[PDB]
Design a protein around this ligand. Structure first.
Ligand SMILES: *[C@@H]1O[C@H](CO[C@@H]2O[C@@H](C)[C@@H](O)[C@@H](O)[C@@H]2O)[C@@H](O[C@@H]2O[C@H](CO)[C@@H](O[C@@H]3O[C@H](CO[C@H]4O[C@H](CO)[C@@H](O)[C@H](O)[C@@H]4O)[C@@H](O)[C@H](O[C@H]4O[C@H](CO)[C@@H](O)[C@H](O)[C@@H]4O)[C@@H]3O)[C@H](O)[C@H]2NC(C)=O)[C@H](O[C@@H]2O[C@@H](C)[C@@H](O)[C@@H](O)[C@@H]2O)[C@H]1NC(C)=O
Ligand code: A1CDL
Ligand code: CUY
Ligand SMILES: *[C@@H]1O[C@H](CO[C@@H]2O[C@@H](C)[C@@H](O)[C@@H](O)[C@@H]2O)[C@@H](O[C@@H]2O[C@H](CO)[C@@H](O)[C@H](O)[C@H]2NC(C)=O)[C@H](O)[C@H]1NC(C)=O
Ligand code: CL
Ligand code: CL
Ligand code: NA
Lengths: 100, 280
């Protein structure tokens, strides 16, 4: 009734990245507690306004999870990321998208 | 039949202080959301045209009223009792209740509750059962709740009588979406791994529905036991993404392939072949 859980943050594209081809960028935030959380998707460090997200849910161990997504067109140079703030974080945690 | 086999509603009630609490709620078929709860109106949002299952509008409205009254009363009662229960603010309560269809046809119902992210209580054969993690606090709660006229009877009816017929009606009403088959796409990538002359190969599988999937790194007909599965991650619009990785010596990556089996493929497995020296 007391131990807080820091969010796990996973950033991935819906389809394999192809420069110039439209795609979708996903940020899955999970395993956190309590539920209050702030999530933004960034393009070259700037907040994307047209972002959608799921209604709050939680897993079997009661940890919350949320999916944030936006349409995006990857390029060779542009950088995308997911920026999260939670009570467990001193400052926002930024996880960059890695097509690998 | 394929697709989800369970319906459940969830509750998250966040108590900021003695005078401020807010509740979020929703309805689900396994991990697929089918209902939202609109706190602006105190009513449900039906996310699919078939989300009411076989229920009449009157019964749906009666259930929304039950939930509205419950959400309001719950916050109020917990604020009144918070002192009696040695409760420090802020705190969060979670609940989940529903039913699931098993092989052989039995439908089993459940209700669980949490405090501070830990199990607190459950409902076992129409009775409030305190969880050990809830300690004496959960014991006091179980003794308190049963004193409230009608509450346990309404829970009993909803869990063991209303939920099973709802579940069956909605699994039938939603079958064209719930039992659709959506083919995955798959691709390979590679990356460095910590060991000397060690590489990590990645088989990506995305866009499949229903959720069950089989992905394996292979050498001809030999399944590579070293295959490591990632967590199944959601996409928007009811599909999933999964990565299967393999850690391999540099000179032994040649000959590897990734094999994907999914219900949608009609026995035509996807097979991707890893090729060396940067040839994709
Ligand atoms: C929403 O759907 C529910 C599921 O309906 C079925 O499935 C869907 C997918 C479609 O294929 C539908 O066509 C189909 O009906 C409905 O719930 C079900 O209703 C039926 C009756 O229509 C009911 O069957 C009755 O069952 C009892 C036995 O029930 C006990 O025993 C069984 C095990 O054997 C146990 O599982 C049950 O839990 C009970 O313990 C039986 O005595 C009845 O027989 C009498 O009636 C039949 C005519 O139907 C007659 O031939 C006989 O001779 C006899 O007189 C009958 O077989 C289902 O059991 C019930 N199933 C569930 C899980 O509840 C649902 O219907 C509404 O609720 C019902 C409980 C009942 O009150 C109905 O009249 C209601 O309309 C439907 N709508 C809503 C709003 O929920
Ligand atoms: C720990 C064991 C269970 C755990 C959770 C249970 C409660 C948790 C903590 C509760 C503390 C206090 C919370 C407040 C509770 C209450 O505020 C309220 C009501 O309050 C008074 O109750 C009276 C009951 O008779 C009621 O009377 C009705 O009045 C009407 C007009 O007069 C009609 O006439 C009716 O026929 C008549 O019944 C009266 O309104 C009302 O005021 N909730 C409840 O009813 C029970 C809570 C139910 C919600 C949670 C259970 C979830 C179970 C769900 C499974 C899935 C649902 C089925 C699928 C459908 C989906 C489309
Ligand atoms: C179409 C309608 C479909 C749309 C539905 C979507 C909305 C659902 C609305 C919410 C109802 C969800 C209920 C889910 C199951 C509830 C589980 O019940 C519990 O939560 C049990 C409580 C668990 C922890 C309680 C902690 C007790 C500590 C508090 C101290 C004070 C409490 C004393 C209270 C007296
Ligand atoms: C209980 O909390 C409410 C809710 O707002 C909280 O306070 C905000 C300033 C911020 O910390 C939020 O995250 C919290 O949820 C308090 O209501 C606020 O009261 C202050 C002054 O009392 C006022 O300036 C704000 O506008 C109010 N905001 C809202 C949303 O009502 C409330 O006063 C707290 N009550 C007690 C008794 O401490
Ligand atoms: Cl409400
Ligand atoms: Cl599924
Ligand atoms: Na209301």
């Amino acid at each position: 009734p007391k131990i807080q859980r820091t969010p796990k943050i996973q950033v991935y594209s819906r389809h394999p990245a192809e420069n110039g081809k439209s795609n979708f960028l996903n940020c899955y935030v999970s395993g956190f507690h309590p539920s209050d959380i702030e999530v933004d998707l960034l393009k070259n460090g700037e907040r994307i306004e047209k972002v959608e997200h799921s209604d709050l849910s939680f897993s079997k161990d009661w940890s919350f999870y949320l999916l944030y997504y936006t349409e995006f067109t990857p390029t060779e140079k542009d950088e995308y990321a997911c920026r999260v703030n939670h009570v467990t974080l001193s400052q926002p945690k930024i996880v960059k998208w890695d097509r690998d | 039949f394929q697709g989800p086999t369970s319906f459940h509603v969830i509750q998250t009630s966040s108590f900021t202080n003695s005078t401020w609490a807010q509740t979020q709620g929703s309805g689900w078929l396994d991990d697929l959301q089918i209902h939202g709860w609109d706190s602006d109106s105190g009513t449900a949002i039906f996310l699919k045209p078939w989300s009411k299952g076989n229920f009449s509008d009157k019964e749906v409205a009666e259930l929304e009223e039950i939930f509205r009254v419950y959400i309001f009363g719950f916050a109020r009662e917990v604020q009144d009792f918070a002192g009696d229960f040695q409760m420090k603010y802020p705190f969060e309560i979670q609940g989940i209740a529903g039913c699931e269809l098993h092989s052989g046809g039995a439908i089993v119902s459940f209700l669980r509750g949490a405090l501070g992210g830990l199990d607190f209580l459950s409902v076992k054969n129409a009775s409030c059962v305190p969880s050990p993690e809830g300690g004496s606090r959960a014991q006091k709660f179980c003794a308190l709740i049963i004193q409230y006229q009608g509450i346990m009877e309404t829970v009993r009816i909803l869990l063991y009588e209303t939920c099973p017929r709802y579940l069956l009606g909605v699994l039938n009403a939603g079958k064209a979406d719930l039992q659709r088959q959506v083919k995955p796409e798959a691709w390979l990538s590679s990356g460095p791994s910590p060991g000397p002359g060690r590489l990590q190969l990645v088989c990506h599988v995305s866009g499949f529905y229903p959720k069950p999937v089989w992905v394996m790194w292979m050498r001809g007909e030999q399944e590579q036991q070293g295959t490591q599965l990632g967590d199944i991650l959601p996409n928007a619009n009811w599909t999933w993404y999964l990565r299967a990785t393999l850690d391999v010596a540099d000179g032994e990556a040649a000959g590897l392939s990734c094999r994907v089996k999914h219900s949608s493929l009609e026995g035509q497995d996807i097979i991707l072949y890893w090729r060396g020296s940067g040839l994709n």
